[PDB]
Design a protein around this ligand. Structure first.
Ligand SMILES: [K+]
Ligand SMILES: [K+]
Ligand SMILES: [K+]
Ligand SMILES: [K+]
Ligand SMILES: [K+]
Ligand SMILES: [K+]
Ligand SMILES: [K+]
Ligand SMILES: [K+]
Ligand SMILES: [K+]
Ligand SMILES: [K+]
Ligand SMILES: [K+]
Ligand SMILES: [K+]
Ligand SMILES: [K+]
Ligand SMILES: [K+]
Ligand SMILES: [K+]
Ligand SMILES: [K+]
Ligand SMILES: [K+]
Ligand SMILES: [K+]
Ligand SMILES: [K+]
Ligand SMILES: [Mg+2]
Ligand SMILES: [Mg+2]
Ligand SMILES: [Mg+2]
Ligand SMILES: [Mg+2]
Ligand SMILES: [Mg+2]
Ligand SMILES: [Mg+2]
Ligand SMILES: [Mg+2]
Ligand SMILES: [Mg+2]
Ligand SMILES: [Mg+2]
Ligand SMILES: [Mg+2]
Ligand SMILES: [Mg+2]
Ligand SMILES: [Mg+2]
Ligand SMILES: [Mg+2]
Ligand SMILES: [Mg+2]
Ligand SMILES: [Mg+2]
Ligand SMILES: [Mg+2]
Ligand SMILES: [Mg+2]
Ligand SMILES: [Mg+2]
Ligand SMILES: [Mg+2]
Ligand SMILES: [Mg+2]
Ligand SMILES: [Mg+2]
Ligand SMILES: [Mg+2]
Ligand SMILES: [Mg+2]
Ligand SMILES: [Mg+2]
Ligand SMILES: [Mg+2]
Ligand SMILES: [Mg+2]
Ligand SMILES: [Mg+2]
Ligand SMILES: [Mg+2]
Ligand SMILES: [Mg+2]
Ligand SMILES: [Mg+2]
Ligand SMILES: [Mg+2]
Ligand SMILES: [Mg+2]
Ligand SMILES: [Mg+2]
Ligand SMILES: [Mg+2]
Ligand SMILES: [Mg+2]
Ligand SMILES: [Mg+2]
Ligand SMILES: [Mg+2]
Ligand SMILES: [Mg+2]
Ligand SMILES: [Mg+2]
Ligand SMILES: [Mg+2]
Ligand SMILES: [Mg+2]
Ligand SMILES: [Mg+2]
Ligand SMILES: [Mg+2]
Ligand SMILES: [Mg+2]
Ligand SMILES: [Mg+2]
Ligand SMILES: [Mg+2]
Lengths: 45, 77, 41
RNA sequence: UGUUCUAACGUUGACCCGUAAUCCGGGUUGCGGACAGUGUCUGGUGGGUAGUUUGACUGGGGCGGUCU
RNA sequence: GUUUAUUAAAAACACAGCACUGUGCAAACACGAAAGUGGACGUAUACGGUGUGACGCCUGCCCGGUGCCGGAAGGUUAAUU
RNA sequence: UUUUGUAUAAUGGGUCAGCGACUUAUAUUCUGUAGCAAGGUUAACCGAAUAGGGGAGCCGAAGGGAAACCGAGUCUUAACUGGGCGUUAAGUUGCAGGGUAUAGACCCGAAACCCGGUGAUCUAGCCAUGGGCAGGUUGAAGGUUGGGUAACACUAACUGGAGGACCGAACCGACUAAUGUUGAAAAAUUAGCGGAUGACUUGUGGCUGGGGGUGAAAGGCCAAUCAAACCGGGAGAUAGCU
RNA sequence: AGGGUGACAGCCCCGUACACAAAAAUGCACAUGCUGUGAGCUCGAUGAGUAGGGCGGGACACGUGGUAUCCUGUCUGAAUA
RNA sequence: UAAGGUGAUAUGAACCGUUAUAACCGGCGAUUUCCGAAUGGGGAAACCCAGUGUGUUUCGACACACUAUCAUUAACUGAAUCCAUAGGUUAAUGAGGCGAACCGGGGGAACUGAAACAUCUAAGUACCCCGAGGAAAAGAAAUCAACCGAGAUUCCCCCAG
């Protein structure tokens, strides 16, 4: 059966990538939270 | 934004109060009007977005004094 | 609004006449067309 | 104690310029014109939306009855 | 044709057709504190809303209630003064 | 454990080890105990000072009355033969403890409400741009020719190739049954079944966001979640219940 | 003080008390330059769409109350020693 | 400062050094790819593609620098439109982004409590947003007091539940 995750790198990057995060205040707050938590991987990029 | 260029009047918040004293949040807006003011020193019309109160200030002080105040703030017109 | 007439204005008076007009009449007509000036001194 | 007027204001008419631009602004002009529209105040309407209430006793509950 | 992905596929939904009703254009209507945008680069043979549901024969009586539409004399009635 | 009552066929525990529930702060009252006593005690602060300073305050030594006010009395009433409350009992500050108050207030547990974000890689609808539909049927309009007509109409043959047309693979579905139900599979397999040029189907990308979307409408769908998604926060919500 | 060392170290080791140290950069505190800044004195001046008001709301411990005072969205509007 | 040393897992190898250029420690310098505010344009971060000026070429090319946006100021220029103004280009200066709390401001819940609930509460709390500083804010009486007086603001203890 067709499951929910149907990977596409283009859609992944456009939806959740670094530049998508940087494009809005709320996306930049995601990056701020993840840097503050000390995440090794900030985004899907 | 709904801001008087002369006075700086802007929307403020408060309550509607019913007879039963139910408070619901509201805004109070300034009575703003875009108006073409004759500037006889410059021989031209300057359009300002002004409250009716701001219009009374211009009548009292004169447009030259008011535009000088706008230049001091950096309020462009 | 008190103004000083400069040109002779009909239904008002003559040069130098102190007269009370509605603020709209002064603001939008008499002053921009150089017929009156605000009574400043 | 009617309408008329233009100058505020409107223009999602035309033309000109910023300009390589169906935005915007400025200008010219026509039309409308103290109307429309907006602010504050105010009467109406308002399950469109919201917060809630909608009792207890009881040979289960409800219905009926009851409550001093 | 459509539908309850995973217990209902149907008589349910839709449908062409019909009717009522709104709408003169900066349309009604909708999204939007707004600017705007859709409606439509359409213009009443158009567009929205509502009900009915091919076609055939048809669709009677009631406007008192509730709504809507029109009226505007009189009563009542807000801020204001 | 809960109960009127449980061997109960009521609850809970497979076993062991480890962890797991009346606390803390401040106020207030009572008891004990210690100090001082008609007094007791200081707060902040100063001080290198657990000292010492600091008595601002607080409690007590007087009550009665709504109060002015009076005062071992006072209030009541015009006034008490009176009557009510008082006089006729030592307090206060530590320390320990019992209770109360405010706080999560013995611990664990909702369904929910609100705020800010993340999500249309599933799915719903739409937008743009590409792709798919073996094979076989049926034979609409129209056309040509002949007949027919005053001319039409009409009518026969040939032609023509319409359709949410027909039969049927791919493709899209999901009507029945059996199996499976700690599955091969958190929805399938097998045999049959419906649509199959369309209101069709499919690839890639895009747009719509939560009281919001989208819905040929089932409260359906919005990432195995939907009569209000998910994540984080208000947050230890509250829980007269277990 | 404390730590280390083959078990528990004042005297084995590193320290500790105490006494000293900076080529260079630098915080600070005073000192005297330059640059700008101008004090003193006499005479005069003394914050208007403001205070105050009406309407609506908010803030004040103070819920419109008999409600002073403050803020102002809206309409107004003084006296100025 | 030195008789040792070439960071760790982690030995080895090849070496360096022992009286001072081994190593080590501190001050001041140098170097400092690419992404990131990211700033030459673009972009699915760590990539793609330029313009201009200079300098160097073995004519194949190579090197370096600059080129964002906004604000302010100045110069040159410059519409409709006569003067003009808008507008345009260049230059100089500044900004931008990040950061745990505290601080000022713009907005601002609900659960909850009231043994229901609407006034009220929770609370101007949580949260969102803007801005700042080493602190911020406040501050030198159109203040209190009570006929006596005090003398800006802030913070602490009382007053007092
Ligand atoms: K015009
Ligand atoms: K009008
Ligand atoms: K009974
Ligand atoms: K019974
Ligand atoms: K079916
Ligand atoms: K009727
Ligand atoms: K029981
Ligand atoms: K049972
Ligand atoms: K106690
Ligand atoms: K005691
Ligand atoms: K007595
Ligand atoms: K005692
Ligand atoms: K709690
Ligand atoms: K407790
Ligand atoms: K929701
Ligand atoms: K030792
Ligand atoms: K006023
Ligand atoms: K509430
Ligand atoms: K309750
Ligand atoms: Mg509230
Ligand atoms: Mg009107
Ligand atoms: Mg309603
Ligand atoms: Mg309701
Ligand atoms: Mg509630
Ligand atoms: Mg309820
Ligand atoms: Mg009952
Ligand atoms: Mg069918
Ligand atoms: Mg089903
Ligand atoms: Mg089924
Ligand atoms: Mg339109
Ligand atoms: Mg029907
Ligand atoms: Mg029992
Ligand atoms: Mg027994
Ligand atoms: Mg048994
Ligand atoms: Mg048992
Ligand atoms: Mg039980
Ligand atoms: Mg059990
Ligand atoms: Mg007393
Ligand atoms: Mg105690
Ligand atoms: Mg998204
Ligand atoms: Mg077919
Ligand atoms: Mg289906
Ligand atoms: Mg099958
Ligand atoms: Mg069929
Ligand atoms: Mg078929
Ligand atoms: Mg239903
Ligand atoms: Mg789902
Ligand atoms: Mg809900
Ligand atoms: Mg809470
Ligand atoms: Mg809980
Ligand atoms: Mg040993
Ligand atoms: Mg003054
Ligand atoms: Mg005052
Ligand atoms: Mg006022
Ligand atoms: Mg007043
Ligand atoms: Mg008022
Ligand atoms: Mg108020
Ligand atoms: Mg009261
Ligand atoms: Mg860039
Ligand atoms: Mg770049
Ligand atoms: Mg490019
Ligand atoms: Mg309650
Ligand atoms: Mg700083
Ligand atoms: Mg300051
Ligand atoms: Mg005095």
């Amino acid at each position: 059966m067709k499951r929910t995750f149907q990977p596409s790198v283009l859609k992944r990057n456009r939806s959740h990538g670094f530049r998508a995060r940087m494009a809005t205040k709320n996306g930049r707050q995601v990056l701020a939270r993840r840097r503050a938590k000390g995440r090794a991987r900030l985004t899907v990029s | 934004s709904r801001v008087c260029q002369v006075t700086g009047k802007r929307p403020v918040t408060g309550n509607n109060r019913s007879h039963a004293l139910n408070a619901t949040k509201r805004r109070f807006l300034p009575n703003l009007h875009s108006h073409r003011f004759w500037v006889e020193s410059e021989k031209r019309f300057v359009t300002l977005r002004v409250s009716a109160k701001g219009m009374r200030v211009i009548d009292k002080k004169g447009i030259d004094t008011v535009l000088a105040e706008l230049r001091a703030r950096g309020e462009k017109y | 609004m008190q103004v000083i007439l400069l040109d002779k204005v009909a239904n008002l008076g003559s040069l130098g006449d102190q007269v009370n007009v509605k603020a709209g009449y002064a603001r939008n007509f008499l002053v921009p067309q150089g017929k009156a000036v605000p009574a400043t001194k």
